Paper text:
[name] domains are elongated, banana-shaped domains that were first identified in the yeast ESCRT pathway protein, Bro1p. [name] comprises a single [name] domain and has a C-terminal “CAAX” farnesylation site (where C is cysteine, A an aliphatic amino acid, and X any amino acid).
The construct used in our studies spanned [name] residues 1–401, and therefore lacked 10 C-terminal residues (402–411), including the farnesylated Cys408 residue. [name] crystallized in space group C2 with three molecules in the asymmetric unit. The electron-density map was generally well defined, including for most side chains, except for a lack of density for the loop spanning residues 379–390, and marginal density for the terminal residues 391–401. [name] forms a single curved domain of overall dimensions: 90×37×38 Å. As expected, the structure resembles the [name] domains of ALIX and Bro1p, with a core comprising three tetratricopeptide repeat (TPR)-like helical hairpins that pack in a right-handed solenoid (helices α4–9). As in other [name] domains, an extended loop traverses the length of the domain on the concave surface ([name] residues 332–365). The convex face of [name] does indeed have strongly basic character, as predicted by this model.
Numbering used by the authors:
A (entry chain B): -1 to 374, 391 to 398
B (entry chain C): 2 to 377, 390 to 397
C (entry chain A): -3 to 378, 390 to 401
């Protein structure tokens, strides 16, 4: 019915156009075909990243077209020879999410594949956040938000697992093509996916125990993401870590809050009060982090967190639940309020999200030992 | 509001109770007078729209009270009354159209008349359940009428059928299997009223599922009991019992789905509701067939009946809920096979209200009986 | 808070006392010693006028009480942390009326008699503040909390008086007067019960389990039964009306118990048993109505507002009717169970919501008392009761 989320998004990656022309070395009509298609499908894919018309199907479709043609430069047709003789033919320049307009370059097709794939995953996360903000979002759309976030995680995960080790020149800290940076995108994608799950479990009036456990695990996801970026230099990674940190605090708050409900239901009203008192602490901390995030410099979203409805819903919830617990303890239970916060040992039995497995398409049919034999400036991106 | 199929009332040839040479005094004469009048008023009421249960009972008691003088001995010694075989009684049958059957046995009149009385209660009930304007007290009356009818039928089959000298041929009302079917049907139909109420009163889905499951068993048990009869005159009736059986199994799967969902078995819940969907569709197929099937038939047809729409609606919404739940929270697989329904209804199972015939009329004395000297017919069709 | 604070509490009249000057001609010398006598004097006077001051807060009351009591401690407690008791305990005679004894005063030349009599009046005031504040049509939540708290404070003071001070008296009060064990006991129990009534009304409102509500109601009823029996020795002349209230509230809350117990039976799918339970409730409700009527006919000091017809009693009446109507519709439509002839014997015990008194202690001796100032009380050297009028009391 309604979705209230606030997602921080780093900028898209931008690349210098590639003609794919090598007039001298490319011989024959079909050898020209793949060079023309490589150019047009890459161009059409780069266009779709900013095309507001694009839906997941279209995106998967355009990525597959390009990727299937690109793998000719990387994978063997033989199903034997190590790698394509074309791997180091071209040079690809990409900006990176945390590095402003300062480009990195490699004459490695894998570098292109990973950088592009990274951008595709990134697009899915932006598609999700835009859609989650649609004014009269339908349930089938909210379901697609969840699914896009899981698709992004799987792509990120695949890149890191089975493509990043192939790179001849390792990427420096702060760069997108680095294990610690990708790992954090996987975790983040999972955690953002669980936010949607948590919202519904609350709208669908589920048991407070399940919600608290979901919220706790989500906070742990955000926490792990923050810790994974600890290595990076504050100059370019601080704004993003702030976000991850406030989400951790935010969902630890939801956890103490809903666990408080669980305690109340167990006639332990005094314990419930203490739980909720801890939640209002964490809510306050999350609000302080929202201000800091605003003050902190780095690439960022146009809508600031501090004062967002997302955070106001938690504040009201914590307030009501606390007051309800004090009301019950004042007139009925009369239990003592423990001095220390409860120890949250919560396991989410249902709702935990796993990335959606990602694979690149097969090498394009166009590639023939014959077609293979025939082989002898950044343009920035605009985001509303 | 319920839809109940109704077989035609039984019609009988009027009997004067005039035995000219046999009856002597004014007391014995008064008895025959009252027999003739009592029997007339009772048959009149069968089609009298203003007849309520109280008028029926009083009219039934009056006639049955007198009629038993032809059957029971007063001696507390003798086996039976000498008058048992003086009168010939001609009755039509619910399933045999206008083809009458006659026996010169007062017990045959007792059972044939009693049968009709029970049948009337079922018709009173179905009429009352036809309104949308029904009082709670009107709901009770519907329920009670069915239970009373059930009891009458049962008593007839148990304590009176065995008395007949020549047993009725298969396909006729006075055959045991046919009466047993009516007993079972009255129970099933009363259960429908109970199910409706328990739903209105927001009872647990487990109880509601169990009830629906039992009423389905009743209907199936009623159908199977009619399996021996010839299709020609029994087909339409069996279609109603089959569609009702399918209809309530659908109700059982629907509410059992709620039970599964409350137990965090969302996949199983969905499969259960998909079964309800199948069975709901099958009930509607049997519903079109009902109208197609030539046989002793009622005024209103079922397809589109609001009562039929409410289930389809409930199944739709409940499946949507389970699908929504599974799409946002549970993410469980949907089993291949529908669940086995093995439910126990701990409360609400209907039992017939025991019926006995009233004591032999006080008018019957040895003196009046002695005044009978034994030494010395067009069936009037019922239009309802 | 939506209509849940409607209650009816019987109240006996406040105690009245003869004014005390704290004037000791030859005995007192100097600024320090004469000041304390002025501070005692003004302090006592101020506290007494607050009792019938509708403006009075528990906060104001607590302040006025501490001020006077800390000063009075000097007539009772030693400064030594050694010597038995103050040399001043027997200088002043104190004159007081009793709640059940009209205007016939009783007096003692003992500062402990004054400490308890005044302390008694303070607890009494806290019960009257609560019942009064509970009559407010638009009561806020904090105010309903105040009613509950005040009753528990009163309970604590009464309990402290009976346990820590009553035994100190030299001459024992007679049967029928306030400084007597049984009478104070009844007040401890009654304040507890009345406090529980509030928790009950709120448990109902917050939709707590019927099993809990039934238990509290039952405990509450037993409190009233205990309080009534605690007064069973007193002479009917003066105790009768008060006891009718107690007996009434006992039947009333036994009815509440059977009612909500019926709800828990119904939810256990024992509809037939539920019906019997509720039938028992309507019998007790009716009996309570008789006691209400009988209450008016019974002679004694009492509240102006009368019990019979009060929304507080109709509230339960409707509840029994509606709950019974629900049980019989369920039985007529679904359950078809038999109704046991005997009413179930309740052996309910509340897991939560039982009220304990808030423990009371008098303030420590005023810092104003010093050996120097006590020294200035030189024992070597050498009254009518001001009646109290309250609007709430007829």
């Amino acid at each position: 019915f309604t979705m209230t989320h606030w997602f921080h998004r780093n900028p898209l990656k931008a690349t210098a156009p590639v003609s794919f022309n090598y007039y001298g070395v490319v011989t024959g009509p079909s050898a020209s075909k793949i060079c023309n298609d490589l150019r047009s499908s890459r161009a059409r894919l780069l266009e779709l990243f900013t095309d507001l018309s694009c839906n997941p199907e279209m995106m998967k479709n355009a990525a597959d077209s390009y990727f299937s043609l690109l793998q000719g430069f990387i994978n063997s047709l033989d199903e034997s020879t190590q790698e394509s003789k074309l791997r180091y033919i071209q040079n690809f320049k990409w900006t990176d999410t945390l590095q402003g307009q300062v480009p990195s370059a490699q004459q490695d097709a894998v570098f292109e594949l990973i950088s592009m794939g990274f951008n595709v995953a990134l697009w899915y996360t932006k598609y999700a956040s835009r859609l989650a903000g649609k004014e009269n979002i339908t349930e089938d759309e909210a379901k697609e938000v969840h699914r896009s976030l899981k698709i992004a995680a799987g792509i990120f995960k695949h890149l890191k697992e089975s493509h990043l080790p192939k790179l001849i020149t390792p990427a420096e800290k702060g760069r997108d093509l680095e294990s610690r940076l990708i790992e954090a995108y996987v975790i983040q994608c999972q955690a953002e996916a669980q936010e949607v799950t948590i919202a519904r479990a609350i709208e669908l009036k589920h048991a407070p125990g399940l919600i608290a456990a979901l919220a706790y695990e989500t906070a742990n996801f955000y926490q792990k993401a923050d810790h994974t970026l600890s290595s990076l230099e504050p100059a370019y990674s601080a704004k993003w870590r702030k976000y991850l940190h406030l989400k951790m605090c935010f969902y630890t708050a939801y956890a103490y809050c809903y666990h408080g409900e669980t305690l109340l239901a167990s006639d332990k009203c005094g314990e419930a009060i203490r739980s909720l008192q801890e939640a209002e602490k964490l809510y306050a901390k999350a609000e302080a982090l929202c201000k800091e995030y605003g003050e902190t410099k780095g690439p960022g979203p146009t809508v600031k967190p501090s004062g967002h409805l997302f955070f106001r819903k938690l504040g009201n919830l914590v307030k009501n639940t606390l007051e309800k617990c004090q009301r019950e303890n004042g007139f009925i239970y009369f239990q003592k309020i423990p001095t220390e916060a409860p120890q949250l040992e919560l396991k989410a039995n249902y709702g935990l999200v796993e990335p959606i497995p990602f694979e690149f398409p097969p090498t394009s049919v166009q590639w023939t030992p014959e077609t293979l034999a025939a082989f002898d400036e950044v343009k920035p991106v605009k985001e509303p």
